[PDB]
Amino acid sequence: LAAALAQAL
Numbered sequence: 707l708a709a710a711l712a713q714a715l
């Protein structure tokens with residue numbers, strides 16, 4: 707989950 711969101715950066 708973190709990675710899925712983190713992609714924004």
Ligand SMILES: *NNC(=O)c1ccc(-c2ccc(C(N)=O)cn2)nc1
Pocket residue numbers: 712713714715
């Ligand atoms: N918001 N951007 C990111 O989080 C992000 C962009 C690109 C990459 C990345 C990682 C690894 C490679 C490689 N060829 O090993 C290339 N680009 N990470 C994060």
